[PDB]
Design a protein around this ligand. Structure first.
Ligand SMILES: O=c1[nH]cnc2c1ncn2[C@@H]1O[C@H](COP(=O)(O)O)[C@@H](O)[C@H]1O
Ligand SMILES: O=c1[nH]cnc2c1ncn2[C@@H]1O[C@H](COP(=O)(O)O)[C@@H](O)[C@H]1O
Ligand SMILES: O=c1[nH]cnc2c1ncn2[C@@H]1O[C@H](COP(=O)(O)O)[C@@H](O)[C@H]1O
Ligand SMILES: O=c1[nH]cnc2c1ncn2[C@@H]1O[C@H](COP(=O)(O)O)[C@@H](O)[C@H]1O
Ligand SMILES: Brc1ccc(-c2c[nH]cn2)cc1
Ligand SMILES: Brc1ccc(-c2c[nH]cn2)cc1
Ligand SMILES: Brc1ccc(-c2c[nH]cn2)cc1
Ligand SMILES: Brc1ccc(-c2c[nH]cn2)cc1
Ligand SMILES: Brc1ccc(-c2c[nH]cn2)cc1
Ligand SMILES: Brc1ccc(-c2c[nH]cn2)cc1
Ligand SMILES: Brc1ccc(-c2c[nH]cn2)cc1
Ligand SMILES: Brc1ccc(-c2c[nH]cn2)cc1
Lengths: 330, 330, 330, 330
């Protein structure tokens, strides 16, 4: 083995991130304005815009969830708050019209109670929301939810970063699989634990397990630009979950912060010290970006441009697009 | 597949940019001063210097086109202005002697009218000038122009970044194919859409489709140094189109700008907000560089040096030169 | 040969460092809090925490050795001081309870005398501590110590960076092999001598020689983050030796230094000018980090997280984990 | 072809520079202090230290040549001055004892006259000193010198960057071949012409042509650290030529320059504007480094360390050492 030792499997793959690839233009009769951006969030739920906001306390509460649903996407309400409060946020969203909404639950002692209260509040999607979904407790929770409330609620499981982990969630009954271990802008898992998987490779691997079973993949973490959304979908994901890109919007929780004449909002990992109240997230800030509606327009605009360049009339067509790998110089 | 999934074609190639390669010196009896720098702009039109200025409103109006033709190259007049005005600029150039001139047209509602007015004004080259030429509307426009005015006017189509797209333009009747999707200094297509093709690979691919049919390739975008011109031609292009490298000259449109004691000129993408009046270009500035004649001398000087080092007596010989690929460290 | 010449062995391998790889998550029923972090320092000695402090005069004297042993690791007392003083430090440590302690010796004229005095003082581990252990004098010293005091004292040899060098130390009777030529944060061997071996590859190679003989590998140098400890162990090392990461602690030798409002401690290579009194180390500073106990908690916390993510119940299981290689972009 | 087009030879090799490789430690019974650093400058001339100073007007005049010879190396007097003056510098050196000295000549109209005057002055080595030696005029000059004065004077030819060019110089009768096109610290050939060859690969290729004919290779350009000297020799070169590393010494031509409280000396390419009086060099400055004797001691010290680490008793043994290739992260 050229990189050391005698075991070719020790270094199992070469992991590519978003910056490692570009989409190749292809024959097209699709104008960006005419592309259909709709896509499956879960087996049953199709969104007008293939974007969902992160279940983070500096990204998604009721205001964000309402704005995301109105924009054609969806919000996933964070779970760093009492069960009654999270449930009350679900009701607030549902009372602003027939709007889709999701909510995160963990696998701890109060997770089941949380899930049932969210169910009672009329949640559409439950997201089993963990740092490591390749584990029996997480798989059991997904399965139990699907068997209990699965007729009326779609159940997402995550996060994973390998084909095997995605396959396990599929077998457990997941209605979507969320991919991302290590890539988040505020994530320090890579440096604290030394663990992660570059996101393009993670998506390609998860999709290899999920697409044959008709289970959509949600690409979660590491998306810095609108072009990354196109790359994630072309790699085979069906939707993208955004934290950093939405944390600077008016609708996110938290106050405006003025530093050196410029406007920012705080954005922090759910595994940061402040969120926990061994951290694997940081507490930072992102530029203030104005209203969500405007940010979503720019993000969807970039996606539409990519669909035009690749001749992709639909997201399902975009999932078949090809990449060129680039070097450091590029 | 080492990079993920089970499809070896998903990541179709490894794309190299100018910075990824150097020209290897070879046996030479060619002194730089004795090299012949002439090259085909189109099937019929040969230039003394293999350089043309970008069809951009901060690069080429009549003054630039006149200076470029006098220097042995050519200007392509931008199309971000009324048809009558663009046509009047063509006439201004033609009235400054027997000077070659080109002009850009799009494929929109007024493109045909624009083309005919430019034809009437005595334009030598029509450049069908689009972000994505791999499309029936663009191919139809090239073909229609060639069948209508092709006896008296050479028709260039662009831009493309793949062998297949170049092949389509050849079939449509293009007299030259312009290559570049993503590499422009002011381009944000790569980050907005996630789309592009590193330019050395794009040129090698386009040339593979174009050279067998005797159709010259114009390398457009990403050229930062005179050495990049040599690299583009060695990769098989016949001419290079320059934006950034010429935007700082006296002959480009726009005022001098003084910032922090240094002189600059504004340079902006035609897909920037200001040019459009979802942007895929930025508005920036480039150092002021003085007269075009002087810039062209330096650029051609570097090209001549490369021709000497590679033993290339002509541009056709330079097109057969070899590269070494370099690493990040280099 | 694509990189030059006609000898494929001239460039013998592609060397990976810590930053080149990440650990892949895997199926897990191991919670970080439940992982067993114990590991072999030497054939006979197992530590509660797989960490030992560097034998450097800005890292380990008696105070550090006592704190490291209490934290479940071990200190290796530096040898840049008179034999009597080093021996007295061993006694100071042993008089603070039944604490494990190691001490460095060289191979110079006074090395044997030093070793015997340390033996008399009750040292548990002798570390034959050299820049280049692939040499008969070093091998002889290891062998002589093992045959003379090997029943009561474990003998470590280092440093090496290749499979062959590790194999030689094993044959000589080493109870552990210490790996690291070039990677230290304060090391300039790479630039002064042009010599080194990227640490992940060095560990994989040394382990290939050592593991089949039941000899533990100590990964020494280049560890910048807690995640690097997990990577080193997953590459097959049994413990990690830390310099930079511990030099900023209260227990390290040396005063606090205030520069630009921030607190630091001096940290210097043992091959720096100041330590020698042709340098292959620098004299620098590292941020002040507070008490060792706290630093060790954070480092072990990150290790525990990695064990959870990789489904590793023990360090021996972690040694079987897999990596993904990452690119520059990642 | 993964990088574009259908010709596998278009991108002929992957070029490595010094930063791309490290020397692997190997079995050693060689202490750095006991290594023999002598090496062939040319077929007949062996130096005590394998270093020669660049033929540049900010590096080598008589003072530098005298100091280099006394240190066990040699200086090559630059040729940017009248023939009589260069000849007078040769005599100045020869009058400071039995000191070896070289002098550069070109291939222009006055080159032969220059060579004969240098011959008359008692020069030991004539260096045919060009940007591109792969050319009949250069080959003819080398051959003519060797046939005319070759019994009493050793003739070096350069510079080359390929196996074929080195082979041509060997056939022409060169007593040494000098390698380096593109790597010089003050060189802009890479950006102006787009031409060059990463130096480790260039050396491996030149050596493949030269070593089988017993012709030493001088590695010229790109050496930034003492470790680069070891790498160049391990790649198969017999000596290293230094510009930047010696330009900051007391013995180099030019005044001390004080900028922002720090001392520098000017260092400029011989193809810079100022040296010429289309530039392919820049005019810069390097830190003041004090006396040559001290710089040479540090450089030879690093070389000796490498010889120790690689078990190389002589430079001929060092030429057989192995490398590990490193990544960007390393
Ligand atoms: O503290 C943390 N550590 C690691 N990942 C986190 C943390 N907090 C949130 N995440 C994940 O990072 C995603 C946001 O990534 P971003 O869009 O790149 O900022 C979220 O949707 C989570 O999957
Ligand atoms: O707004 C834009 N977005 C993307 N490409 C552009 C834009 N404007 C001009 N271009 C292209 O970029 C080329 C100039 O590239 P440059 O010489 O690297 O500055 C032009 O000739 C166009 O092909
Ligand atoms: O001066 C030096 N030159 C090269 N390596 C050194 C020197 N001093 C200590 N070391 C090694 O560097 C290790 C510390 O590396 P660090 O933890 O990255 O700072 C030590 O345990 C030694 O193996
Ligand atoms: O102007 C120039 N352009 C390109 N190479 C130069 C020039 N001047 C000197 N050189 C070469 O660069 C070498 C010095 O490289 P350095 O030691 O890296 O600074 C010299 O020995 C020459 O071979
Ligand atoms: Br601590 C910690 C908390 C959350 C995460 C995570 C990764 N992807 C989604 N959530 C990772 C670590
Ligand atoms: Br067909 C087609 C038409 C227009 C585009 C485009 C993308 N960005 C700007 N223009 C792409 C494809
Ligand atoms: Br919006 C937009 C406008 C122009 C371009 C382009 C790329 N190459 C030549 N022109 C791309 C995007
Ligand atoms: Br033949 C030949 C002669 C001179 C050159 C050259 C290039 N740059 C500076 N000198 C190249 C080839
Ligand atoms: Br000088 C000098 C002194 C110590 C080292 C070293 C490398 N790894 C452990 N110790 C290297 C060079
Ligand atoms: Br099973 C299992 C449970 C929790 C983790 C973890 C690592 N970092 C944060 N949480 C990993 C694996
Ligand atoms: Br202009 C010019 C002048 C000298 C060189 C050179 C390269 N290596 C040695 N000398 C290159 C270009
Ligand atoms: Br054998 C042998 C002995 C000492 C060294 C060395 C190199 N740098 C510092 N010490 C190398 C090899």
């Amino acid at each position: 083995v050229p990189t050391g030792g005698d075991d070719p499997t020790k270094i199992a793959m070469l992991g590519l991130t978003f910056d490692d690839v570009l989409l190749l233009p292809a024959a097209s009769d699709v104008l960006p304005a005419n592309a259909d951006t709709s896509s499956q969030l879960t087996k049953k739920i199709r969104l007008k815009v293939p974007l969902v906001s992160s279940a983070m306390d500096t990204v998604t509460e009721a205001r964000m969830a309402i704005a995301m649903a109105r924009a054609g996407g969806m919000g996933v309400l964070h779970r760093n708050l009492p069960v009654a409060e999270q449930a009350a946020q679900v009701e607030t969203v549902k009372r602003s019209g027939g709007l889709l909404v999701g909510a995160a639950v963990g696998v701890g002692d109060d997770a089941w109670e949380r899930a049932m209260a969210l169910r009672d509040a009329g949640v559409d999607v439950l997201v089993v929301d963990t740092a490591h979904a390749h584990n029996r407790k997480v798989l059991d929770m997904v399965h139990r939810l699907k068997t209990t409330v699965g007729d009326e609620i779609e159940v997402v499981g995550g996060n994973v970063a390998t084909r095997a982990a995605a396959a396990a969630l599929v077998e457990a009954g997941a209605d979507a699989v969320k991919v991302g271990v290590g890539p988040g802008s505020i994530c320090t898992t890579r440096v604290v634990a030394g663990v992660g998987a570059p996101q393009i490779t993670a998506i390609l691997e998860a999709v290899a397990a999920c697409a044959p079973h008709g289970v959509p993949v949600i690409a979660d973490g590491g998306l810095q630009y609108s072009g990354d959304i196109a790359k994630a979908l072309a790699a085979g994901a069906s939707t993208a979950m955004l934290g950093s890109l939405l944390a600077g919007t008016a609708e996110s929780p938290g106050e405006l912060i003025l530093v050196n004449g410029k406007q920012f909002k705080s954005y922090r990992g759910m595994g940061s010290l402040g969120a926990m109240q061994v951290p694997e997230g940081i507490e930072g800030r992102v530029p203030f970006r104005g209203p969500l509606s405007t940010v979503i327009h720019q993000l969807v605009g970039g996606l539409r441009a990519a669909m035009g360049y690749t001749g992709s009339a639909t997201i399902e067509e975009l999932q078949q697009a090809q990449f060129v790998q680039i070097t450091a110089a590029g």
